């Protein structure tokens, strides 16, 4: 393009970083302020402005405003201050922004697909400008993290997620497509006000919803290829869990809550087996809550035990689960699903109804809380957990902070610094009365899903297996240095996630090429250089055409 | 255009007012939320949101945000609530927004012309997309109303001014071009910070500034025609006053502060001569401050007296002026300019140094304050003014409110409701202890410059005369009904300015065709229908192409 | 535009005349052959290629091919060799090309409007890209000069005509719009073959045809303005003659056959009155054939006599007409139209049935043949014409050459060089046996309609009067030098028509401003400079944007 469109397009826009020659010979002279800046000056200006701001919503509005103007500047700002701005971009700020401000974006981002557009989804998909997209993030709006049902307003969530894809992994922004599929909303507040921009109907729970999802996946893979990575995001637990099982084999789909969270938990455990002398195989594990997330975590733990020489049937005997009714045992009154069968064992002597006595009798070395029904972990639970184990491992993986079973202060005060605590929700460092300030391990999916997504995209993988996340967990555990392990950190520092994500991608890429899951040939000689070439870089590219004089 | 560009262009964007057929056959299906709205729903949504907001800056950011997305919706919102949103758009909110937020706009508006771009201004002008523009507003940034020197940040002022052109007069938005000519800045705050987007030099006061203005006017009239209306806005008093004299004859230029303010003051006086039985000719007038603004007001008053039968030399004897040094009289110690000569008369007996004794001895029937050095009108001045005259006329035309000579409460309390008070600055209604709440006449240029601009544009006028504003003042006085005159209102209500402006245009148009100042031929048979057809209307236009089946 | 579109657009295409810098910085590097040429080299190449060609059809195909590739080069080639290439472009070559080759053009030229598109003509007109067009040429296809009914294939005729507008007058190519209105065809050859691209119906002679013409004119003047010049070209004689009368007052329409031919004939007579001592007023004129063309010529001759002091009723007594039945006299058996009444006089003594005895008895000084029924002028007619008059004036204005009444050889051999012969059809020089080679005056409309069209366009004239063509005829007679008059030439040389046309425009422009028929104000001080600035010039314009370095 030339002239004004070149400024309007966020991909090609440089702002006042257009050099004088580019302005003069591209038609931008007089349309821009006289100052000529670099990308550093532009980044410093926005960093100072963000530092002046005091609330996450103001920062979110500011950064999402600069995203629509200059994308390279936006990602430069993100990568410059990724640790601080990542909560502003993805969680929990974007959900709250969708709740309060509604629709913030001034430009068409992604595709809105209705239940009224059934039978014609391919026509909608054909409207997207970019011909090659590699990653698709789909939102229903039903279950926003901590905000509930937001209807069609939950479109900012995929945008915030794809921002993390580009900022951490390096996936090209134009290869990403955010999609919102709206079938109504259940909350009455949006159904009542006349200015809600979605359908004025309750959420469609009939077969039309399933058919719409089928048609959408078929259309998107028809236009963009069978290896397109499709991620179902903020669907209902029922919908997301069953959709992953349905589309797992036919399409390239992976779920962060089931699989990314399992990878993060396994990485935390593999780091704990380095902090503590005893390995992962020896120590018994107890799960609070039995569900698809708990089953995924336990399956991945069993895989990790198996690759270390333990028999699969023997490895499963170590993992214990605590359902809502009680300990998951043979002969239990409540029904046990087929998937929960491997981890259901012969009943112990006590057969305890309460989780506390289950901890007391089973003597679990590791405790993992995924139930997310509240503060299920109690001070009695934690002191008991300390009683059996010299260095107990406590995981509170359910988020938001309200749903988390344990708090960092509770874990580090009930146990006088002996425990290893890892939680999905962010917690401040705990300062004991004696001293020895402890920062609790905070493991979120952003460690896993960017690098895994990049590795899957680069290798043209069509089916993502469970062991891909095992390799991702091992890779993530690998970047921890011995000094950090001495400090007791379970996860790599979040300030340098990019170098983490790329490294993870490398390892995953190698695995994908080792087991014939990668369809991009010829095989790279070395995977590190291969992935490092492909990552998108936010540096501006000169638009000056080559000018010379003929000999 | 088709597809995504159709949404990105503010001129052609409809938002969710795109009908389903337009979305389907224009490529917008899936790029817009499923809801289909009308222009009324969109206007109500923004009106409610603006009503929720509590500060002028928030409202300004919101409305200028919707301007960049949908221009027809923006002007519909303005015309719906013109009285409330006009201070938000033009004064004093836009200057304060430029002061605090800097550059708000996310899209290229107008042209930035540097002193470093001398010799190549035509190349800059050629970069503007629209081939036909009728009105150009030029800002220097030197003298923002109440904020001082803002440098290149004073670009929002022409945008806010052109918004009033389109909202009140009905001039097409694409016919307007805002231009900022930046030659440096004098304030050290902008010269010190590294993120100022202008030139890092003090304001260029040399001959290069004059040559740049000459070159800019030549280039703009070369590209867009000699009848292009060019308005110098927020220049320094010296620069603006001398530029109007220099370019008045060669180009189509008019100045609101010199000529629009004079028209508003004369309209107020012509309305007072209806409120008070005695006419304009009889009553003596005293001016506080002698300058180009005061000279313009006095010249226009003399013209009004002359058209009513009074001799010009005899009419000039009635207007008196009070310079900074003292009463403007023969033999005065201080120099008297050539332009101030007609209103300089033989000295009275007292020859008073102070303004108070000048009022006491001259017995002025009307007092007009344009000096703007502060609260020059004192309680003693106002009680004296009441002493001579049963119904004194007091004008405090200098703005901002700080620079205004008098306050509405002072005028209406020192004079027990007898005075007629008109001021440029807005004042709340005055409630006396006895009762009889008085609203002070508030006459701003927005009465005059939209209608006069529309009339000049429609008739292809090349030279705007002084008597055009005399006709505008008479027209503005005409819309006042007898009920409003009984209420004591000097100006028409501001809530229905559009019907005022069009009416003014009509009258001005007639005058332009009466005196061979209009170059658009053939002459319209009736001017009212002629102007009413031409005004831009904010109603959306269907983009459905005509579809039929051949016989 | 930039890159490949810049080459594809004929308006902006330069071919290999793009300089190396333009190619490099406009994206054309590698898309063009390495050679860099000028406007002269390109013109010389095409001139040599045309000189190699031997038939008019090959030349027509070649030049109309270069028109679609480079318009500036095409018009440079035309203006370089206008006399030779004008018959190739307009007449009689383009009609024969439409007859044989059908549709030659590879690009959309003009608009095709059907009788099946009635009720929606404005939708068709809105499809034309150019927003400002000044001249519109409309063809029906019914009466092609010498080829008969060609149906929709007669679309090349307006294109060839507008080529003459641009080449001779200098009207901008993008201001011209060729329109073909097809209502069927009468010839069975086109109705029979399955590949005819028009309607498969006989020509619509019902009221729908008239309504379609009305709707088309209304739509075209609605989109492009009331002063748009619309020219009905190659309509049937009935249709064209009645349409000129119907739309003459309401729209800006003029007809070459009625009015241009009359202007050319009057110019020839005014040149003859310089070649022969006696003036136009003295000499009696006899017309062969009485019709709208003959009535137009006679009316214009009467106007010329009147402006020279002769009374209108007395001037009309000199012009005589010979209808099909016989001499046009009082009491004639055949009906006489209202328009033919002024030139119908009291019967002479003979009242001759044959044209020959009419010449013998009336003793006409001038004879004009417009009937076009064949070789109506006979050797007996010409020898009789020589018998009465020492230097007879013979005009054979009907074309093609087959329809012409007289031949140059017949006129110059039956009269031993004494006669002055002017004909519409082209004739070679006549070489008598004694010697004194005589070239016959060849007066075609191309003398008149380009200059008159340019003058009408420049002055924004809304109604073209009859006396405009009187001024055009006088102007055309004026360029003849005394040397050419001594040579006996009735018309200026055709090799320098451009300097003729511009001159004609000048004079016409002056007349339009003298009689308040011109609506473009302010009035130019001198009309010559005014028109000379406005003429389109075929010189290439550099596309290099201005590049400089800031001080
Ligand atoms: N100015 C530009 O925007 C520009 C210029 C040149 C090339 N490209 C891109 O290079 C691509 C060529 O593909 P390739 O030769 O690199 O294939 P590849 O063999 O290197 O990689 C295999 C797959 O990985 C995809 N991929 C590679 N890098 C990616 C990234 N950073 N983010 C998301 N997906 C990525 C590729 O699209 C490809 O499908 C073009 O299709 C085009 O998308 C873009
Ligand atoms: N996106 C994430 O961060 C993420 C990912 C995975 C898991 N989780 C967490 O997992 C937990 C639930 O996920 P899920 O997939 O298992 O949902 P689910 O619907 O599949 O099942 C939830 C399980 O929790 C058990 N449970 C509920 N209340 C209990 C109680 N008071 N006492 C004991 N057990 C109880 C139930 O037996 C049930 O099986 C939540 O904390 C959730 O936030 C979060
Ligand atoms: N979809 C569109 O945007 C669209 C469609 C048709 C016509 N137009 C406009 O109509 C114009 C035709 O001019 P005209 O026949 O009306 O001239 P006119 O004789 O009616 O008026 C004379 C002058 O007044 C100008 N003018 C008229 N209305 C104006 C307005 N509301 N705001 C600012 N200037 C105005 C005109 O540009 C013209 O120069 C086109 O040049 C084009 O600008 C726009
Ligand atoms: N844009 C507007 O709203 C507008 C328009 C016209 C005039 N004004 C007002 O006119 C007044 C000045 O405008 P100007 O064009 O005359 O400026 P100016 O520079 O041309 O001259 C100002 C005049 O004010 C006189 N003066 C200054 N201080 C005085 C004092 N203490 N006592 C008596 N006289 C004093 C001076 O003699 C001087 O002649 C200001 O209130 C200004 O705000 C405002
Ligand atoms: N690169 C370009 O193509 C380019 C650049 C600048 C201006 N222009 C043209 O100049 C026009 C400005 O009009 P103006 O100021 O000259 O009006 P004008 O006062 O000079 O003339 C009056 C009328 O004559 C018309 N006209 C003038 N010259 C003509 C020509 N050679 N052929 C056909 N019609 C002609 C004009 O369109 C106008 O309507 C623009 O509308 C635009 O059409 C074109
Ligand atoms: N485009 C041009 O070059 C042009 C322009 C004007 C006139 N003409 C010529 O004018 C002549 C006809 O044009 P028109 O407008 O008068 O058509 P028309 O239909 O209006 O009338 C033709 C006239 O010719 C008369 N006529 C026909 N045959 C005759 C005959 N054998 N003897 C005597 N008179 C006869 C008839 O009385 C009739 O009135 C043709 O030569 C035609 O080519 C040509
Ligand atoms: O990158 C871009 O396309 C970009 C485009 C711009 C266009 C015009 C003016 C400033 C621009 C800036 C800098 C900038 C800003 O961006 C912002 C903002 O975004 O709020 C505010 C500014 C305030 C004062 C000065 C500069 C500011 C940009 O960076
Ligand atoms: O006109 C336009 O082009 C326009 C374009 C839109 C595109 C997508 C969504 C809403 C749009 C709205 C409505 C709208 C808004 O415009 C805004 C806003 O402007 O802040 C906020 C909204 C919040 C919730 C729902 C609708 C909102 C528009 O009007
Ligand atoms: O003006 C133009 O856009 C133009 C565009 C051209 C593009 C490619 C090659 C020649 C071009 C020529 C020159 C040219 C020709 O044009 C033609 C032709 O037109 O038949 C034939 C050629 C044969 C040999 C060499 C050059 C010839 C042009 O002029």
Swiss-Prot record, chains A, B, C:
Instruction: Tell me its family.
Output: Belongs to the malic enzymes family.
Also noted in the record is: This isoenzyme can also use NADP(+) but is more effective with NAD(+).
Q: Give details on activation and inhibition.
A: Subject to allosteric activation by fumarate.
Q: Which domain of life is it from?
A: Eukaryota
Query: Cofactors per UniProt?
Result: Mg(2+); Mn(2+)
Gene3D superfamilies in the cross-refs: Malic enzyme, N-terminal domain, NAD(P)-binding Rossmann-like Domain
Which key words tag this protein in UniProt? Acetylation, Allosteric enzyme, Metal-binding, Mitochondrion, NAD, Oxidoreductase, Transit peptide
Q: What does this protein do?
A: NAD-dependent mitochondrial malic enzyme that catalyzes the oxidative decarboxylation of malate to pyruvate.
Gene name tied to this protein? ME2
* Residues annotated as binding a divalent metal cation: 233-234, 257
Q: Name one GO cellular component term.
A: intracellular membrane-bounded organelle
Q: What organism is this sequence from?
A: Homo sapiens
Instruction: From the Swiss-Prot or TrEMBL record, give the protein name.
Output: NAD-dependent malic enzyme, mitochondrial
* Subunit details: Homotetramer.
Q: How is the cofactor bound?
A: Divalent metal cations. Prefers magnesium or manganese.
- EC assignment: 1.1.1.38
